[PDB]
Amino acid sequence: KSLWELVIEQFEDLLVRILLLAACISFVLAWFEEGEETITAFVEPFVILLILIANAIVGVWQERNAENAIEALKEYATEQDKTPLQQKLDEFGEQLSKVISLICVAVWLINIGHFNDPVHGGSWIRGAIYYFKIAVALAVAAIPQGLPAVITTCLALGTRRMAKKNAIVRSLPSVETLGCTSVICSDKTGTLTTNQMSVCKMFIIDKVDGDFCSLNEFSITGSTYAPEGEVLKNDKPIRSGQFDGLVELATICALCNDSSLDFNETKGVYEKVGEATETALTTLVEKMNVFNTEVRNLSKVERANACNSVIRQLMKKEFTLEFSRDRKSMSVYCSPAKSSRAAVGNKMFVKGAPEGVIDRCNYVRVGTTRVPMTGPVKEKILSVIKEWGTGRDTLRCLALATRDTPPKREEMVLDDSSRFMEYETDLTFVGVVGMLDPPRKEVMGSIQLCRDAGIRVIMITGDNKGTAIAICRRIGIFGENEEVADRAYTGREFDDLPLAEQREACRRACCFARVEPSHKSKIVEYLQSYDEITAMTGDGVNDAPALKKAEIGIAMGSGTAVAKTASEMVLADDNFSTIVAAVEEGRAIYNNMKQFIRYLISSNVGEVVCIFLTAALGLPEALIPVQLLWVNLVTDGLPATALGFNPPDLDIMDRPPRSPKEPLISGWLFFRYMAIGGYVGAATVGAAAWWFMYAEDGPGVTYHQLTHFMQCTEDHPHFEGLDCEIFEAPEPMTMALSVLVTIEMCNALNSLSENQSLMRMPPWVNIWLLGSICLSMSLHFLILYVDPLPMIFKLKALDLTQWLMVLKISLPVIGLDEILKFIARNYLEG
């Protein structure tokens, strides 16, 4: 059950029922009076009922549009769980219910002296019932009904829109927190950058003298997974079969990888089989072709695996050593089979992260030579390792080596992967392949959007800290000259920090490189310590316990279904930009709720000001009960509902993330409610008071007469030349009514955005609201001009002259908010 539904939606229904009851009591009592057997006696109950029918029709169509949105999305627990927002809306509704109740009792109490008035027949009871019908009808009107159905729509409206932007939400209460997101922690590879990495640069050993180590760098072209491209040396097109060093490197590439290149004929472009990393080497082999096999004549469907198949028989893989996270490399054992190359012994190819394959290296091959890995051969090639991955391109270096004297196959463990590393201690060295994946377009811009939004991004990659930082500088996470030695840590560094110092690091960090699986859950632990709403991404099962600890666990479309199920939202895009585009939508929905609430509260305040003002001033009452019901049906109805179709605001990603601690209504916003409320409630009684004092063929009276109108029968000398029954005239009541309905249709236009002016976001930015306004307006004109109708609601037709007065009075309500929305943008926001 819902506390808001119980105290507002249901309470409003009982009020209508007891209102109708009050009507039918007046019906029975209007029999014992004389001349009251007229055919007007049934009219009032017949209207309160007839309006209740239309108010119900609105309810049905408002519920039918809500259940459809939820179902259209779905198509294509000991009762103790509620969102902080749901706890606030239920606290709100309880206050509104209580406040309106006191307010309406006060309406009935301030009219005690008006009970025995001659207008009621001179009976105290007959008047005491009337003002009861007033207070109750006001209570029905004042109540902001329809909230849950409008939210339910918006909640599913954005969800359909998020799915359009590849953002697939697991749960619905999740999207509320998406807008409150403070920190977005995301994996670099696959998300912040596409998985289309190819080998663009590569270098090997050229000439070696003590402290004179020379390198032979190469630059390959064609960063697509295709043999399209030629290897270049010093910007000079040279065949790969011109250097003996490329021979050894190409050999390891095609033998250590388990990646194929199935050219899909229907695609037209070469595709990828296996892993993205290893696939690049396969494309590298074809683009090099040191064997100088016939290339062009081989068809598109086989060329990709052509030069790759030349080595499939040159040697043959015996067994392949698996990858281990500790060693950070992998190896194959290849005794030359079917090639008569077994006479020249057998070798062992390895492939992995530089440092591991260099520290555990003792020899450096020079084309077809062997040299003991000394000092200069190490530091003067690892300088290139650094300057490659730290430059403009930010390459992912991958050292390639070979073991000329491998341990016997008669001695090898397989159940223990930690032993694998010990089989790779002594080996030669060939070269290193520079490899890059490109960051997605405008991630740098999507990073920017977060910064403006006050949302912090934290990168979690597997690169070294040097290139990890270089990546952040490329995508604007870090400044090009900012000292980031305080905002970037590694697995070894973060663990070497004091426990209390570690959480302090998470208050400033934006990058993490070479990270243990346990750190992700350990970072969320620290981010939650600073009370930050954390959106964490993941792909592996190592991320699984972290996607439950984080506020918004974010999975991957290409990721395993284990994380996709145990998350709150899944990226079918595998894009980082999808994360923030879904954050934006989370904010857009909450704003749409605040526009809905603002319109109702502000307007309905005036409706309460209206009744209280005329009573406190001494003016003839502006509204009878059945008119108050018409105000509600027309303003609290379709126009307010269509407010849930407002477009996303403009100042949406510039304001800081909304805290769950923030009250539902701020101080300024409450004042803003009262101000607009204050005006419409005064502008409506000033409309009726205008008919009296200043209107043409509206009996011009002094303000003093109008205030003391009850003495008209007595004060003949003070009310000379006037008719006492003119204070019961329908024209002023029509002016008050027409203004109130118009000024609320104008106030609806104020709720297309919270702070953006109507100049920035025009009234036609929401067509559904325009139609709603048109409908309510035409419906009001129907009551005024279709002859049986004005008699019923005690109204008279308005001519063009006094319809313009309605405009002159109403339209400034747009003017007032524009004054306030100006102050909000320029004196509060920024």
Q: Which residues bind K ion (CB under 5 A)?
A: 548, 550, 553
Given Ca ion, ligand PCW, K ion, none, residue 632, with its beta carbon under 5 to 8 Å by kind, binds Ca ion
* Residues in contact with 820: Cβ distance below 8 Å, sequence separation at least 6, in sequence order: 672, 675, 676
38, two tokens: 């007229």
Size of the site for ligand PCW (CB under 6 A): 15
Q: Which stretch binds ligand PCW (CB under 6 A): 93-101, 400-408, 432-440, 756-764?
A: 756-764
Q: Which of 462, 344, 491 is nearest to 397 (CA)?
A: 462
Helical ranges in 180-299 per DSSP H: 245-256, 276-288
- Phi-psi domain of 27 (left: phi exceeds 0; alpha: psi -120 through 50; beta: other): alpha
Asked if 757 touches ligand PCW (CB under 6 A), the answer is yes
- From the CB of 170, what's the least distance to K ion, in Å? 9
Q: Which of 13, 117, 187, 787 is catalytic?
A: 187
The beta-carbon contacts of 533-536 under 8 Å, at least 24 apart in sequence, are 533/177, 533/180, 533/181, 533/182, 533/183, 533/657, 533/660, 534/181, 534/182, 534/183, 534/184, 534/185, 535/178, 535/181, 535/183, 535/184, 535/185, 535/579, 535/583, 536/185
Q: Which stretch binds ligand PCW (CB under 6 A): 82-90, 401-409, 781-789, 818-826?
A: 818-826
Asked if 826 touches ligand PCW (CB under 6 A), the answer is yes
Has 187 been annotated as catalytic?
yes
Asked if 341 touches ligand PCW (CB under 6 A), the answer is no
DSSP string for 658-706: PPTTS-SS-HHHHHHHHHHHHHHHHHHHHHHHHHHHT-TTS----HHHH
Asked if 765 touches ligand PCW (CB under 6 A), the answer is no
Q: Which stretch binds Ca ion (CB under 5 A): 97-105, 205-213, 625-633, 748-756?
A: 625-633
Among 173, 376, 730, 812, binds ligand PCW (CB under 6 A): 812
Given K ion, Ca ion, ligand PCW, none, residue 636, with its beta carbon under 5 to 8 Å by kind, binds Ca ion
- From the CB of 391, what's the least distance to K ion, in Å? 38
Given Ca ion, ligand PCW, K ion, none, residue 811, with its beta carbon under 5 to 8 Å by kind, binds ligand PCW
Q: Are 363 and 428 in contact (CB under 8 A)?
A: yes
Residue position matching structure tokens 């590298």: 284
Residue placing its CB nearer to Ca ion in the complex, 240 or 635:
635
What's the sign of the alpha-carbon dihedral 770, 775, 777, 781? positive
Q: Are 518 and 541 in contact (CB under 8 A)?
A: no
Residue placing its CB nearer to K ion in the complex, 82 or 825:
82
Q: Are 289 and 241 in contact (CB under 8 A)?
A: yes
Asked if 716 touches ligand PCW (CB under 6 A), the answer is no
Q: Are 351 and 398 in contact (CB under 8 A)?
A: yes
Residue position matching structure tokens 């229904």: 13
Residue placing its CB nearer to ligand PCW in the complex, 648 or 812:
812
Asked if 739 touches ligand PCW (CB under 6 A), the answer is no
Residues present in the chain in total: 830
List the interface residues with ligand PCW, window 671-690 (CB under 6 A): 679
Residue placing its CB nearer to Ca ion in the complex, 143 or 433:
143
In the bound state, the residue with its beta carbon closest to ligand PCW is: 815
Asked if 756 touches ligand PCW (CB under 6 A), the answer is no
479 by Cβ neighbours in 10 Å (0-12 / 13-18 / 19+) ranks as exposed
In the bound state, the residue with its beta carbon closest to K ion is: 553
- From the CB of 69, what's the least distance to Ca ion, in Å? 23
- Phi-psi domain of 203 (left: phi exceeds 0; alpha: psi -120 through 50; beta: other): beta
- From the CB of 683, what's the least distance to ligand PCW, in Å? 9
Given K ion, ligand PCW, Ca ion, none, residue 553, with its beta carbon under 5 to 8 Å by kind, binds K ion
Question: What is the H or E stretch that residue 185 is in?
Answer: strand 183-187
489 by Cβ neighbours in 10 Å (0-12 / 13-18 / 19+) ranks as buried
- From the CB of 561, what's the least distance to K ion, in Å? 16
Residue placing its CB nearer to ligand PCW in the complex, 161 or 825:
825
Residue placing its CB nearer to Ca ion in the complex, 494 or 630:
630
Q: Which stretch binds ligand PCW (CB under 6 A): 291-299, 408-416, 510-518, 754-762?
A: 754-762
CA dist., res. 39 & res. 624, Å (int): 19
Question: What is the H or E stretch that residue 350 is in?
Answer: strand 347-352
**Residue numbers at the binding site for Ca ion (CB under 5 A):** 143, 145, 603-604, 632, 635-636
Residues with active-site annotation: 187
**Residue numbers at the binding site for ligand PCW (CB under 6 A):** 679, 757-759, 808, 811-812, 814-816, 818-819, 822, 825-826
